[PDB]
């Protein structure tokens, strides 16, 4: 009946990993920024005709909890790499997260989606070209999202499931 996809949301602290996950789970945005350690959510969704259950893992952006990273990057099937379009270095930190995933998983072939969050913000530090060119370099789709207006939230998770459908 239901195919299970295990998703992991990685990225630097404050980029909105929790906000995106909470938006898709319980359908509202909050500006509290309650810092994350680790949280799991399971939601039933319909994807392009296929009924599937999503296993979402929300990771900590603070490297203080980097020890748990070696353990969850070996469990999930796809990774949602999120940076803030108004934070240059979180965009730079994307390369670090990919490389760590590639060598914990011990595979270049790992299903992933680049996510630039906080579209609603007026001032932008990372242009679309920088993320798009980086996306082709990694051979993965790039999706721009805004957790506050819910733009691209489903799109990003849905594309990750489609990428996980690699044979």
């Amino acid at each position: 009946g239901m195919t299970e996809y295990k998703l992991v949301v990685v990225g630097a602290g404050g980029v909105g990993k929790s906000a995106l996950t909470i938006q898709l789970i319980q359908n509202h945005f909050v500006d509290e920024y309650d810092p994350t350690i680790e949280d799991s959510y399971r939601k039933q969704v319909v994807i392009d005709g296929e009924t599937c259950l999503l296993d979402i893992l929300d990771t900590a952006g603070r490297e203080e909890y980097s020890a748990m990273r070696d353990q969850y990057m070996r469990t999930g099937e796809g990774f949602l790499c999120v940076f803030a379009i108004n934070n240059t270095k979180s965009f730079e930190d994307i390369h670090h997260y990919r490389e760590q995933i590639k060598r914990v998983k011990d595979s270049e072939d790992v299903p992933m989606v680049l996510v630039g969050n906080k579209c609603d913000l007026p001032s932008r530090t990372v242009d679309t070209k920088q993320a798009q060119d980086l996306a082709r370099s990694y051979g993965i789709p790039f999706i721009e999202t805004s957790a506050k207006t819910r733009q691209g939230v489903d799109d990003a998770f849905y594309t990750l499931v489609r990428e996980i459908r690699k044979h």
């Binding site: 319980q26 509202h28 309650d34 810092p35 350690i37 680790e38 949280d39 959510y41 399971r42 979402i56």
Partner: protein, 73 residues
């Protein structure tokens, strides 16, 4: 550095506690607010089903770091 694990029906949450002398009541309220929408819910310890952890009691009094978020009856 100091967190508790709350096991729920549809996942788990690691809840950081600033100090070890927090209520079991305060932990429950943060658990429901993160797992669910807001705000019929009780804590039990994972090792022993149906303990109905005392909400007055502190975490120092508890002999566990793992509790289950379960609905009343």
């Amino acid at each position: 550095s100091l967190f508790v694990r709350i096991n729920a029906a549809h996942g788990f949450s690691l809840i950081q506690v600033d100090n070890t002398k927090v209520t079991m009541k305060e932990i429950l309220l943060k658990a429901v607010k993160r797992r669910k929408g807001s705000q019929q819910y009780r804590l039990e310890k994972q090792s022993e089903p149906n303990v109905a952890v005392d909400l007055d009691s502190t975490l120092e009094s508890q002999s566990a770091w793992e509790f289950c978020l379960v609905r009343e009856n």
